[PDB]
Amino acid sequence: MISLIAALAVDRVIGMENAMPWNLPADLAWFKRNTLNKPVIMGRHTWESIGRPLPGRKNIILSSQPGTDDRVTWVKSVDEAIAACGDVPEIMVIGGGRVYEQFLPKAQKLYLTHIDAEVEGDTHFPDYEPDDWESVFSEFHDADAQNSHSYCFEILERR
Numbered sequence: 001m002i003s004l005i006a007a008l009a010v011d012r013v014i015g016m017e018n019a020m021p022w023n024l025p026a027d028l029a030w031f032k033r034n035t036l037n038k039p040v041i042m043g044r045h046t047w048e049s050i051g052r053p054l055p056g057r058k059n060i061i062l063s064s065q066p067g068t069d070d071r072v073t074w075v076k077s078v079d080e081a082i083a084a085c086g087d088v089p090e091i092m093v094i095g096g097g098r099v100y101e102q103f104l105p106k107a108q109k110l111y112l113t114h115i116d117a118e119v120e121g122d123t124h125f126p127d128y129e130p131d132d133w134e135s136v137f138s139e140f141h142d143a144d145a146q147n148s149h150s151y152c153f154e155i156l157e158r159r
């Protein structure tokens with residue numbers, strides 16, 4: 001099973017200038033809990049944005065060019081990325097925009113954080129057809145002293 005996990009600001013913005021400009025510790029904790037001990041697939045731009053391997057996960061990087069770091073697994077196509085994960089129950093695709101576009105048709109589950117923040121950005125999460133997805137979990141949180149915007153965690157499953 002393939003799942004996508006992402007955090008979206010208003011208008012589905014996910015990034016600006018290869019960065020995420022907000023800081024929401026509760027969302028990073030949600031990301032860690034839902035990805036730990038699973039393989040994570042990311043594109044090369046997101047690998048450069050993160051800047052180091054994510055511990056406790058098999059890190060698979062999609063790039064057309066040879067890898068430059070043997071602490072992670074480099075693959076050259078979607079099918080190779082999937083095969084490199086092996087026979088696991090759940091593969092997590094962690095972006096960025098172009099990678100989400102390629103895996104969305106193959107995904108059964110979306111883990112989305114909706115952040116109430118207006119962000120100039122240059123990368124968006126793909127348009128997804130709402131009729132194809134059922135919301136199976138949602139949890140709203142107001143802003144607090146650690147998290148400066150309100151946010152909504154949602155899990156959607158393909159119908």
Ligand SMILES: NC(=O)c1ccc[n+]([C@@H]2O[C@H](COP(=O)([O-])OP(=O)(O)OC[C@H]3O[C@@H](n4cnc5c(N)ncnc54)[C@H](OP(=O)(O)O)[C@@H]3O)[C@@H](O)[C@H]2O)c1
Pocket residue numbers: 005006007008013014015016017018019020042043044045046047049062063064065075076077078094095096097098099100102123
């Ligand atoms: N808010 C969130 O949840 C979230 C999550 C992830 C990322 N982001 C943000 O998203 C932005 C990066 O997204 P992006 O769309 O620019 O880049 P991306 O999807 O991270 O990376 C695209 C790169 O991945 C490689 N790639 C993708 N598909 C491939 C394929 N089928 N075969 C081979 N290589 C493939 C290519 O690398 P080569 O050029 O090396 O071939 C391509 O240029 C940043 O702003 C980051 O902060 C946000």
Ligand SMILES: Nc1nc(=O)c2nc(CNc3ccc(C(=O)N[C@@H](CCC(=O)O)C(=O)O)cc3)cnc2[nH]1
Pocket residue numbers: 005006007025027028029030031032046050054055094095112113
């Ligand atoms: N919901 C969500 N939030 C994100 O921030 C996010 N980020 C990415 C890509 N970027 C990043 C950037 C940093 C870290 C990171 O530092 N993660 C640590 C934090 C653990 C914690 O804060 O408790 C990790 O071990 O996962 C992960 C992904 C992909 N999907 C996401 N999905």
Ligand SMILES: [Mn+2]
Pocket residue numbers: 077079
């Ligand atoms: Mn092929």
Ligand SMILES: [Mn+2]
Pocket residue numbers: 086087
């Ligand atoms: Mn197999």
Ligand SMILES: [Mn+2]
Pocket residue numbers: 008009012113114115
């Ligand atoms: Mn949203």
Ligand SMILES: [Mn+2]
Pocket residue numbers: 116117118148149150
């Ligand atoms: Mn806000």
